[PDB]
C-alpha cells in the first residue's frame, strides 16, 4: 500500500466489440421516449418508423 502510484496495482478492463457477418446479439440501451397518444407524431417501434 505504501508504493508509489507507478508501482501500485491497477485493475484494467478492456471491452472489445466483435462485429461479424452474423446477426447481432448485443445492443446498447435502447433510447425509448414516453408514449404519446391522440396526436400526429413521428413514431418508431423496434426500428419500424
Amino acid at each position, epitope marked *: 500500500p*505504501t*508504493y*508509489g502510484v*507507478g*508501482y501500485q496495482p491497477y485493475r484494467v478492463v478492456v471491452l472489445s466489440f466483435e462485429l461479424l457477418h452474423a446477426p447481432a446479439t448485443v445492443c446498447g440501451p435502447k433510447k425509448s421516449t414516453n408514449l404519446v397518444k391522440n396526436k400526429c407524431v413521428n413514431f418508431n417501434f423496434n426500428g419500424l418508423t
Partner: antibody
Amino acid sequence: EVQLVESGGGLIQPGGSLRLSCAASGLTVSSNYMSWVRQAPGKGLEWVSVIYSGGSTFYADSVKGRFTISRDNSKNTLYLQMNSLGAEDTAVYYCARGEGSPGNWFDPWGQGTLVTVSS
Amino acid sequence: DVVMTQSPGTLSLSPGERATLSCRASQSVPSSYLAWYQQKPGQAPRLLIYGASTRATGIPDRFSGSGSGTDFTLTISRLEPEDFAVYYCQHYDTSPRFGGGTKVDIK
C-alpha cells in the same frame, strides 16, 4: 565461459556515423534482453538503449532518433548504429544482458569500447 | 519517474572499517526494483546486489544491502584496499535509472 567482447570504437567526426558490435559467448543474444549503457569521461552511467528477446527496441530520450539497436542471431552479435554523433556522445559504451529490472538485471558486462567525437 | 540520489559524493575510510552508502528516492520504490553495482577504475561495472538485499554470485559476504521505500543502504564491512571503486544504485520505473555514484577512498 560467458563473455561479451565489444568492438567498433574509435574516432568519429561530428555528424558522422558509427556501429558498435558486441559478440556474446555463453548466452544467446536473440533470446535475452540486451542493453547498451554509456559512461561519459569522468561522469556516471547512462542507459542508452535496449532490445528485447521478442525484437522490441527502446531508446533513451538523449539518443532517440539517432541510435538504432539490432542483433544478428547467426553471429550472435549485438549491434548499435549511432548517427549524427556530437560532442556529448563521446563516452565508453558497454553491452550487457538484462534491463536492470527485477530478475532482468544488467549481468554480465562487456569490457566497453571508447568512442571519441572530434574533428 | 522516480529520481535516485546517492550519498556521500566521496567516502574516505581506513581498511577494516564499516562503509555506508545511501541511496534516497523521492518516492517510495519497492525493494525488489533496486540494485547496487560496483565499478573499479579502468573496469566495467559489476553487479554487487540485486533486489536491494540479495548478494550477486561471486560477491564477498562483506558486501550487504538493506533498506526500502525512500532509503536504501549499501554496507561494506571490514573494508579492504581492493574495495576502492565507484558504487551506483540503479532502479527501473519506466526505464533504467542510475544514481550519481559514490567514490569510496581508503585512508
